[model samples]
Target: SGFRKMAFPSGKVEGCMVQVTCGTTTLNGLWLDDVVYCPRHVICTSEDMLNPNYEDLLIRKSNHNFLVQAGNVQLRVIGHSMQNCVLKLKVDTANPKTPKYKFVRIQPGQTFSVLACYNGSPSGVYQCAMRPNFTIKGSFLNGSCGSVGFNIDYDCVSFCYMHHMELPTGVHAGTDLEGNFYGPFVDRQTAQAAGTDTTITVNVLAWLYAAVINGDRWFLNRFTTTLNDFNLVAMKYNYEPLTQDHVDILGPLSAQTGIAVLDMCASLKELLQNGMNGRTILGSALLEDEFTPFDVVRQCSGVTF
Candidate 1:
């Protein structure tokens, strides 16, 4: 057979862990000839770009731009621009006013890819358009100009989008609760293709940081103060004088959680009288300048240790 058939391992269905390979070589994440899901959790990662056993894939490329095939969608790149452009997608005969998928401000010279679920329809089609500040020449195997259409059948491969745009400043790549990969993938895969970047890394930190900053203003204000008070109370109760460092860790506690912070010490005392135990003093373990903005808010809000 020209193309190979491979099953996604049982435990790794939600991530990019199992490398689909041709002997020792990894296949391009795109160009999947077919995809099939077993009755269970497994799905097919079969198909190949270079197998004599399989059919050839077509992507029209020029000195200025190129178009690559993703599962149900074909990604078209216009590389001649000096600024970024928006790539938009519309599923099977849908109106162009609303997009099923859209990646904003895709920088110049970036190729995009993503796995799509087009259900079981073999004859489905998807249309794509590229919008930029200036005019540029581009085409697909089917046609040319700013817009092109392609098939959205199962033979299309699954892949994350690739790009040259750097993850935004202070954004670190991380995973969601479900463990699916989400982060910037600016890292290039030299083995699989040329001038292509990975989608394994995303702006996980950017979103997380934004979440913390926006959601926990009360905690952020009072964190340092509360810790300082907790340490001071703990030391005084133990008959120890506050040290310079002690006062330092005795950061201001928040007005909202201040009652809660003070309640912690009182609760600690009540527990101690009932034969329970607790940290006798505060130290670097209890306080540090290296606290993440999120951690600071969480701690001061009395959410976690």
Candidate 2:
């Protein structure tokens, strides 16, 4: 028989079209239009910022007899007392092995400013106070200052100066992506019941697309993590092993893959049924960014079925 229509149920083949013949008809060669391929919330701890158990050293204190303000790369301390006082600024105690500090002298009716202790990085809590050796010998000249006082008064005259975390680069890095995904897979049935997308290949491809398009390093890191684990899952089930080449294809074709796999498992189901339709299927409407049939053809080059 010559080329003939492949019969199917009425209206069941709206987008699907096929041609066939009874005799052994050789499959046609690749043409410009022939290619069709397809494509947590955890809240356990609740505590106030001022929780005594987890107090941040950066909190500002105002009851001190002296005042210290952290500037760009320096700290300015002002003495209200009419007496000369020695003072030391404690920069960092977070590290037991490498505590850092700076010292400054404050004179009556004078102001002093010095370079910040942490090499001018300027973040976290910086504490400064009148040294214990200095003493005040008079009633409150300023209502804030105490009357006769000794090194014991030093406790009453300390200030917490904070330099907010400000980085010029404005990039926070080193988030663990693979670590997060593997947790969900620890119990595969639980994850699937909770609507997790088990089609790892397509999901990984979509993730790569989204990450590259957004230019977010964290997203890219996450996608890579998922890919590694996805491959492992595939191997566990004895499916054909996925090579790095398949994973690499994701980088160049992620945008298209992303459009094709937008609806979680439904998209994958459609892909299995219809291959890759340039037009709409499974909520992926045609648009400039949407994956086109042509994209699939190019992407599948040298890729074995």
Off by over 4 Å in 1: 1-66, 80-226, 229-259, 264-305
Clashes of 2: 0
Candidate 1 per-residue lDDT, tens place, 1-305, comes to 01111121211111211112212222122111122101100011223311321111112212122223333454333221111111122112222222122223322222222211221111212211111111111212211111111211122322222211122221212111111223332122122211222111111111122223334221222222344554454444342222343223223332323333333334433332443233321211121111222233333343411
The deviation in Å at residue 125 for candidate 1 is 26
Question: Which candidate number maximizes lDDT?
Answer: 1
Task: Give the range where candidate 1 is weakest over 10 consecutive residues by summed lDDT.
Answer: 35-44
- CA lDDT scores, all candidates in order: 0.23, 0.22
lDDT of 2 at 23: 22
C-alpha-based local distance difference test score of model 1: 0.23
Residue 286's lDDT within candidate 2 is 22
- lDDT tens digits by residue: candidate 2, 1-305: 11111111111111111111112211110001221100000000223211222122112222232222222222222211111111122222121221122222232111111112221121121111211111111111111111111111112221111111111222111001111111122201111211211222433333334433434222112122244544455545332334555545444454444532223223333333444455432223321111222223323332221
Per-prediction TM-score, please?
0.19, 0.17
